[PDB]
């Protein structure tokens, strides 16, 4: 049921070794040059169905939500997932920096993509919500790869419902504040993630936070939302003055305090344009490469129930840098999470 082939290829030169996936390939070059039929991390494919998930004992579901028509800027994010999956072939599922085999530690599965209904934000978001719900209810934590930054609306709703009478935090890392009460009357575009979360019955201001804002594509109402609701914003200025680590640990403490679950949405435009040109609206004065990897390490020490990464557009990138940066956001989060769990004596 939870099965995959180390280094992908079946047929006469199949490898069968149970640990072959964390070692140099033996019979051939695996997927390192030619992608073939690669799933995320070479993980087994598993339908986003709570029975199948639960039967495989999967603890991490990778689920792509490519929807990019909830967006007030420009389409392209729908091509992200495919470049992500390709970039994972350039890596092993083993991380020497944490001494962890990500794949076997988490029994990670690739849940494929969430279907879309073109031109129908409302129905596509219900699909996403349903799909996430199956992953949570199958007993797994979730990686969601966008797609538009409309993604935390159905994502936070899925987690809110599943959390029940518990309490949920919401962390938002981004170049933009994304707190339009509405955008030309629309409540559910990619620039209203934070207000929509605050609307959820078990998500409270005190367990919400934003990081990474700078420059001037933040209308005053998006700022005013944070001020009026007393939600911790850490600008890019403060992150640089006080240190990434200090700020990060502080807000992770704030969003985890007396919460059962955490929703963490991470917009790739939080990353400096030099490192992430392939973006829906890329901005300078952002995280450096080493900082992205450090923030992902920190997030993994703390843990979240859903990590979403959004707004990656490979069409606007000549190289592999964007896709590989995005692999690293995930892989360092998972590696760090595994290292932390192992030292605590746990999953």
């Amino acid at each position: 049921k939870w099965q995959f082939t180390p280094h992908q290829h079946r047929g006469p030169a199949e490898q069968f070794g149970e640990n072959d996936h964390i070692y140099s390939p033996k019979l051939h070059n695996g997927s390192f040059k030619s992608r073939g039929l690669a799933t995320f991390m070479g993980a087994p494919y598993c339908p986003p169905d709570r029975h199948k998930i639960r039967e495989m004992g999967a603890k991490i579901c990778f689920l792509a939500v490519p929807w990019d028509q909830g967006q007030i800027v420009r389409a392209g994010a729908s091509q992200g997932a495919a470049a992500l999956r390709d970039a994972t072939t350039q890596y092993f599922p083993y991380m020497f920096e944490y001494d962890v085999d990500l794949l076997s530690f988490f029994r990670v599965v690739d849940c494929g993509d969430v279907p879309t209904v073109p031109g129908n934000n409302i129905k596509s978001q219900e699909y996403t919500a349903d799909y996430v719900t199956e992953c949570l209810e199958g007993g797994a934590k979730v990686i969601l790869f966008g797609g538009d930054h409309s993604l935390p609306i159905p994502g936070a709703k899925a987690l809110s419902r599943f959390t029940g009478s518990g309490k949920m935090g919401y962390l938002h890392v981004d170049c933009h504040l994304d707190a339009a009460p509405d955008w030309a009357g629309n409540l559910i575009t990619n620039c209203s993630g934070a207000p929509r979360a605050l609307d959820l019955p078990n998500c409270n201001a005190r367990n919400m936070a934003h990081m990474g804002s700078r420059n001037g594509l933040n209308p005053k109402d998006w700022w005013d939302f944070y001020v009026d609701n007393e939600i911790r914003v850490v600008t890019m200025s403060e992150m640089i003055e006080r240190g990434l680590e200090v700020c990060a640990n502080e807000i992770f403490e704030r969003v985890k305090k007396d919460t059962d679950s955490l929703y963490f949405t991470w917009d790739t435009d939080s990353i400096d344009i030099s490192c992430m040109p392939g973006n829906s609206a890329p901005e300078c004065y952002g995280l450096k490469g080493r900082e992205v990897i450090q923030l992902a390490r920190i997030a993994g020490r703390h843990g979240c129930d859903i990590l979403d990464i959004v707004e990656f557009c490979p069409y606007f990138d000549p190289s592999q840098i964007g896709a590989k940066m995005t692999v690293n956001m995930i892989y360092h989060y998972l590696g760090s999470r595994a290292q932390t769990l192992r030292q605590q004596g746990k999953q």
Binding site: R214, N215, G216, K220, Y285, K288, D317
Partner: protein, 326 residues
């Protein structure tokens, strides 16, 4: 009305700003503090071609931004107008420079701060002269410039008004004491031996990129800001964005590794704005042809707009923060 500050309910100009002819009286009435002037002139350039399309490409990038800057609680609406482009004639440099000169004199008589988007670095020679002539010999000018290249060729290919000569000409101006001149970024090998010799001979205390890194950048920048603004009646500020690291501004005529990061320049901008005024702002050598994602142009745009926003905040020209969409 402040509807533009907030989320909506339901020509090609710098910042979507109103146009106003290149005319001292019109500009004095128009209400703004800055006048954008494109100068698509390429014919000082000996390196790679492209600078002549930067004014358009720079204008276009600036369209994508909101006027409100939450970091400073400033709105830029109505702070700039766009005077269009200076009318470049046909392979006639001397007459081209004469036209730019007059353009700059015009804007300066209005009171407003020209933002001069090149085009090649040599346009600075004549813009700086214009400021020089405007203020006259009873006043004192200061000059600050960011670049990887000193541009201190007494003459180049047997010519004297080409981009690589620019500082050599600028440092001859009679009311610009060398002690009020700064140059920040010089690195790598587009700096031949005579540019140094001449700098030593005239007392130009350029701050090379690695002098800056060794001093932690900001302390040495602060001293150089001081030399330029303290005691002077007018200040010229110019940017060649090859002062930045290659990865941060690929779209420039002569990109160089080992330069400033974007966050270092945002802090330097605030240091400049603390002095509460500047007379001319120029940018040259943007070269959009070799830049997908328009990384360099986006960086330039953020540097200029942040400078505008930061000067305003220093001036107390903020918006009332109690205001709400509702």
């Amino acid at each position: 009305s402040y509807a533009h500050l907030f989320s909506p309910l339901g020509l090609i100009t710098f910042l979507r700003s109103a146009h106003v002819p290149l005319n001292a009286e019109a500009l004095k009435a128009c209400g703004a503090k800055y006048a954008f002037v494109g100068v698509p002139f390429d014919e000082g350039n000996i390196g790679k071609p492209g600078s002549e399309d930067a004014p358009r490409e720079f204008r276009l990038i600036t369209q994508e931004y909101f006027s409100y800057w939450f970091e400073y609680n400033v709105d830029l609406h109505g702070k700039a107008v766009d005077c269009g482009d200076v009318s470049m004639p046909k392979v006639s440099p001397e007459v081209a420079h004469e036209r730019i000169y007059r353009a700059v004199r015009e804007v300066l008589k209005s009171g407003l701060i020209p933002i001069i988007c090149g085009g090649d670095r040599s346009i600075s020679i004549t813009a700086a002269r214009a400021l020089s002539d405007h203020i006259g010999p009873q006043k004192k000018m200061g000059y600050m410039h960011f670049g990887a290249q000193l541009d201190m060729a007494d003459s180049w290919a047997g010519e004297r008004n080409l981009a690589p000569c620019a500082m050599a000409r600028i440092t001859e101006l009679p009311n610009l004491d060398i002690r009020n001149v700064a140059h920040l970024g010089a690195r790598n090998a587009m700096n031949p031996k005579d540019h140094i010799d001449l700098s030593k001979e005239r007392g130009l205390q350029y701050d090379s990129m690695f002098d800056l890194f060794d001093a932690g950048i900001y302390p040495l920048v602060e001293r150089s800001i001081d030399r330029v603004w303290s005691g002077t009646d007018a200040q010229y500020l110019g940017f060649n964005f090859n002062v930045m690291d290659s990865s941060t501004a690929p779209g420039v005529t002569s990109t160089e590794p080992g330069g400033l990061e974007s966050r270092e320049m945002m802090r330097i901008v605030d240091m400049i704005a603390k002095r509460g005024g500047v007379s001319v702002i120029d940018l040259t050598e943007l070269c959009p042809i070799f830049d997908i994602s328009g990384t360099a142009a986006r960086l330039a745009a953020c540097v200029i707009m942040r400078l505008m926003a930061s000067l305003a905040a220093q001036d107390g020209d903020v918006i009332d923060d109690k205001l709400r969409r509702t």
